[PDB]
Symmetry: C3
Subunit: 544 residues, 3 copies
């Protein structure tokens, strides 16, 4: 038969207590007056001199009656002002033992804790702002990501990160651009008292309903940025970071989210980016690969110029597409939603977005607002224009006259009602003539078969000057053209306007085709000066 040896109230009373093999004792709390970290202990004479402070304490082996490793069982004193060394022993023990770590009371740390690989740490606190919290009492990262991949694989479940002094510290920081790789942030809250929510090189990390800056334990006057992932081009780039139902509120730095090194695949599913006060943009990134917003909100950012601003050199890499798929955007920014610093890229898709604008939709690298050349598609969008808002030629539900996209190429199309006046159209300007001189207008060729015999119709509108206006001398010519080898065939079907050259400014010309298949215009009568032609082709001929 075996009886209970006794009960102890602290770890100091356990190490000084002597026993024999098989004896079991009850410890009520790691420290006196506490109930946390307590556990049953069985004595082992083989390890009587072993005392690591957690599992074995001078022969007393932890029995894990609760089946869970807690930070209190590693020396975390709730009455103490600091728990840094206790947390370090907790991460080292939980990872070396290959078991999850549980934070059972709010910790306060003044020294960083390096993130050991495969760390799974969870909190048993309340919901959202009353979750199990870890506060940084100094201007130091709560966790330090190791260099290279030494911190790869981790799990952070329902933990809150605060700072004792507003505008200091961060939850994570990387040494030598170390990778915070293959991690999960489940319902983690990042208090606005932090200077940076996450200042580590993130890769392959998913965020499940995290919160950045909604709640604020102490006032932050320096600034708050949600994420800053800085890496190295080619070897350590911030990649594959997805956000589900996350919230980004009350930012005060130059941007809320930032990453460089042409990091790839940052996407936001049903996220909420509102009530920020960023000075430049909500997302400032030197990135490649597309960036997509699948549902969510981008609103209430009246003082932020841009929603997203891409940087870098397009020769090295670029974002091809930024898609806003069904985003509620009630005043998302103040200047333009998408700001480009490279030419042409990125393109934008606004699919079913809804809200009111005090800004432009996009801005090119040269400052052109609402550049349709940057609009890959714009369908089913509803935008009301407030003071400062503009859409330009971009199509909306209330502005059907705009364009859905810049260009589309199809191999076939059936359009019932088509409106296109510059169809097979070519413009040639600065056609300077003297009396009776000849000037080439365009080159004729078969549009499908190279070097083949062409044949079609030409509508030429010649005017005096460069661009037509009210009272501009005009003339129209209808020409049938075709070729058989060196033989050129042109027939003027008709004409109208000032076609006789009664004055120098009259666009009067006779048409021919030379040996180079060039449509040549010869001045008629007194015609002389600078003219401009516009050719509209039909059939098996093109004017280039």
């Amino acid at each position: 038969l075996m009886n209970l040896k006794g009960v102890v109230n602290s770890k100091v009373e356990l190490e000084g207590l002597s026993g024999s093999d098989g004896q079991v004792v009850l410890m009520t709390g790691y420290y006196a007056g506490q109930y946390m970290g307590g556990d049953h202990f069985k004595y082992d004479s083989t390890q009587a001199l072993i005392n690591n402070g957690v599992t074995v304490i001078n022969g007393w082996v932890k029995q894990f009656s609760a089946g869970v490793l807690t930070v209190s069982a590693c020396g975390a004193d709730p009455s103490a002002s600091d728990h840094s060394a206790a947390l370090d022993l907790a991460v080292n023990t939980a990872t070396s033992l290959k078991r999850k770590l549980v934070v059972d009371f709010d910790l306060r740390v003044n020294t960083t804790t390096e993130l050991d690989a495969t760390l799974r740490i969870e909190g048993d606190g309340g919901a959202v702002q009353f979750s199990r919290s870890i506060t940084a009492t100094a201007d130091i990262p709560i966790f330090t990501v190791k260099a290279g991949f030494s911190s790869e694989s981790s799990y952070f479940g329902k933990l809150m990160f605060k700072a004792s002094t507003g505008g200091t510290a961060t939850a994570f920081r990387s040494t030598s651009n170390g990778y915070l790789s293959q991690s999960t942030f489940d319902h983690c809250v990042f208090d606005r008292s932090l200077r940076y929510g996450i200042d580590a090189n993130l890769i392959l990390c998913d965020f499940q309903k995290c919160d950045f800056g909604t709640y604020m334990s102490t006032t932050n006057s320096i600034g708050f940025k949600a994420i800053r992932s800085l890496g190295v081009v080619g070897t350590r780039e911030p990649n594959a970071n997805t956000f589900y139902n996350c919230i980004f509120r009350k930012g005060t730095d130059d941007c809320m989210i930032e990453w460089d090194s042409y990091g790839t695949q940052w996407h936001f599913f049903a996220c909420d980016l509102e009530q920020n006060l960023c000075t430049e943009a909500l997302i400032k990134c030197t990135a490649s690969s597309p960036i997509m917003f699948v549902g969510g909100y981008i609103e209430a950012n009246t003082s932020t110029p841009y929603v997203i601003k891409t940087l870098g050199n397009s020769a090295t890499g670029f974002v091809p597409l930024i898609k806003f798929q069904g985003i509620h955007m009630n005043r998302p920014c103040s200047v333009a939603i998408g700001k480009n610093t490279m030419a042409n890229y990125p393109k934008y898709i606004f699919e079913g977005c809804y809200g009111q604008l005090i800004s432009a939709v996009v801005e090119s690298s040269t400052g052109v607002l609402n550049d349709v050349a940057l609009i890959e598609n714009s369908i089913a969008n509803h935008f009301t224009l407030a003071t400062g808002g503009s859409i330009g030629d971009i199509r909306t539900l209330t502005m059907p006259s705009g364009f859905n996209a810049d260009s589309r190429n199809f191999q076939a199309a059936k359009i019932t009602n088509l409106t296109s006046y510059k169809h097979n159209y070519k413009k040639t300007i600065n056609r300077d003539f003297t009396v009776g001189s000849s000037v080439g207008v365009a080159s004729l060729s078969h549009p499908s078969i190279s070097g083949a015999s062409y044949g079609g119709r030409l509508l030429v509108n010649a005017i005096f000057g460069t661009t037509a206006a009210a009272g501009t001398n005009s003339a129209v010519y209808e020409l049938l053209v075709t070729s058989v080898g060196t033989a050129k065939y042109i027939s003027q079907i008709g004409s109208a306007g000032l076609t006789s050259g009664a004055a120098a400014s009259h666009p009067s010309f006779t048409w021919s085709i030379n040996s180079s298949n060039v449509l040549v215009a010869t001045a008629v009568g007194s015609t002389a000066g600078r003219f401009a032609m516009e050719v509209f082709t039909t059939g098996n001929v093109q004017a280039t």
Copy 2:
């Protein structure tokens, strides 16, 4: 020291006397039970304190398991009710800022107000054998407080049932109170409930939840998954996302419902099948787009519509309802999308696959398959059963249909284009007498306002209004251009009845007046009602 002893109930602990530091083991909160048990240390400073959970006449709960359980708050498994125990549990867990765990199935006849920051979880089985909470009265299991007082919560793996089918609900709002910033992780909603959730949801995500698959007791009145009623302007149901959720066997007027122009309700890979709703699957007075990104909408043969939008478009509206890659095997009986407002919402069907016993959309005026409501229709496959119809909407098996109503591009290269009404204008009711002149269209430069225009016009004039078999017809080819007040028109050619041999012949000579109007003058005996159709080319447009 030594262990003081073992007790079998809470009443045995409070009647037990002790001194400071003494530790006792309680085996269960009530006699004959092994739940709610914990170690207790005596504290003479709190000898008169007895809240029933943490301190019991000086005995402080030691949390040997490290978790707060509803059984440790007075929940008696042998008792028929646990209402007062649950209220004390949520109040204790929230005030202590720690998670609450439901360790056995609860039965409640009085509501429990949702305290803020409540994290409550269950340790039961999977799906239908999860930790369950049954309402033994027609009352909400949880009551959301008014305003934002219930904001922040977490519900993990909890099933909600009703002792009587067709009664009670898991959640209800006081004065349209906000159920804000919550998460429903693998929560099951039994069909015995009258409503799965009858609260004003906002900023809530649903992770693999189930609505109405399982049924504990027969419900003859009806089951609705979600009904969120709010207040316009101040409390609107917004930002509610559903991932991999299941909605089966609904029997009310709809399965999902929200009003007040609530925004951003999206469904990722959800399953809406086997329902028996009388009106629609989703009946909502909503604004902002609504999206279905993957999933199923099928087996709803008795449900008229899949989604039906309501409200006034002047206040707000849904701009787009996108069905992105949805498997739709008989999703409804009349039309997938039913509109109450004109024009809005537009619809996108991207890669959908299934069989139709209904139309695709129905406008506010009842027009089935109104292509004006189709923002895009690409890569869809729909098999037509009895009652199914697609109209002019394009499918993989019906390429003759249209992908969309309209698209505007600044540039385009189309290899093979089919467009006969290109730069086309029709003018009817052109009544002529012998030699009279009637304007047909206004000419202008199509890109530069007021500039000199110049191009060609193809005019097809007919007798009457609309062409038919044997209709007198005539075609004219005209070159036009202008220089200030000077108008230049040249008839390149003509064909047909162009001489006016009879009154019904569409014979006209063409001119341009000072108002830049293309004027037709009757030729010969031409008199009566005629109609023209103009096709322009070049720097001229007929308006």
Copy 3:
């Protein structure tokens, strides 16, 4: 006040221990020398003869001091080489008691354990590769899915599956293609030592941050396949399986993911498919319904021919669309991303993809690379071509001359600059003429109203032979046509080229309209031989 009776060190010491009603004992571990499976026990004389091995042991009732059911409390011996019978009792106990099961130490099994319905089993191990593991010491499935729906409803949280011998065993297998239905795989890791990660018929299963084949405990030379779900057509189909942020690396079988029976709705949100060595494709499936990739990576698979290859008979079912929405694709395969076995289907959408190609974009069932007829849409894509890469006529950001899609039909459209030369175009070949003979070219009719009076202009380009080339005899004709009942009206507005028939090879013709509304050409002069016509219509007339 009753005192604690004593302390026990094993389950065998409890069953041999006698007691009276109400007495409580403490067991330190289920087996001697162990601290797991321990719990408090209270004696019940009514159940003195009951001994199920977990809850009641010869009258001693388990008190659940920790409040959690563990596999160690069901007979799992850490010192034993096998835990199969203990695991089987654990699933039977946890499901019959309707409470979650916890694996507190790594298990090793040589016999399968059938999946009881509603099983919720979790692990308390580390993160990712150091998670709580279950190893199969034989060529057997770790879990066996029951036939039909008998295993429906389950939850697997943070568990890892390994094999003692590389290339053997699997985590799941189905009896009679039984349904692994309504399950969740949360952060589960599948070691590459397995022959198959999952070889069961999956349906209504979601995968949350799972890993397939990144880590390899022991060397696998036979092969590793991530998922293979084989079902029955009509009755047992693998449906409704969604993957969020999952990783698929280093496959060595014929494919990485496989399912048949025209299973529906397999989607991949922000998944990672890279560094595989698959022999045929990454995804080989006989599937129906669309397949979508919303963000993620498909790269570094230089030895894999295809990314996805659909099979089956389109009469039974087919995939209508395979969408790659914003996918990073740096060398995703070696021949073609999409391989079709059926005609026409599936269609492909590449929306904002970014990467480098050593392959084609698609390959049809007849082997045609980059068949534009299979491209439903291709917008904002950036693809750099390496050796073996090709896009054909598919449009990219750097190759704007390509097509975004094969065809689009709109009821209305406003295009500022339209380039379309085969507009309202018809070609008729093999027009064989003798001296003065007549041959029909096309049928004329109203394009909107059936049988109504048509009226418009026709541009006809007649050539000698069939297809135009350099030096081909050509002639152009401009015709105004209209009809009034049996009366046909045609007027040659003009002509150009070899229109007089001076030689036999000249395309010289006179145009008329017969009673069948056919545009008839009559040879002029000496014209005789093989000719071809191309007609371009305008107005209320069409040439068919």
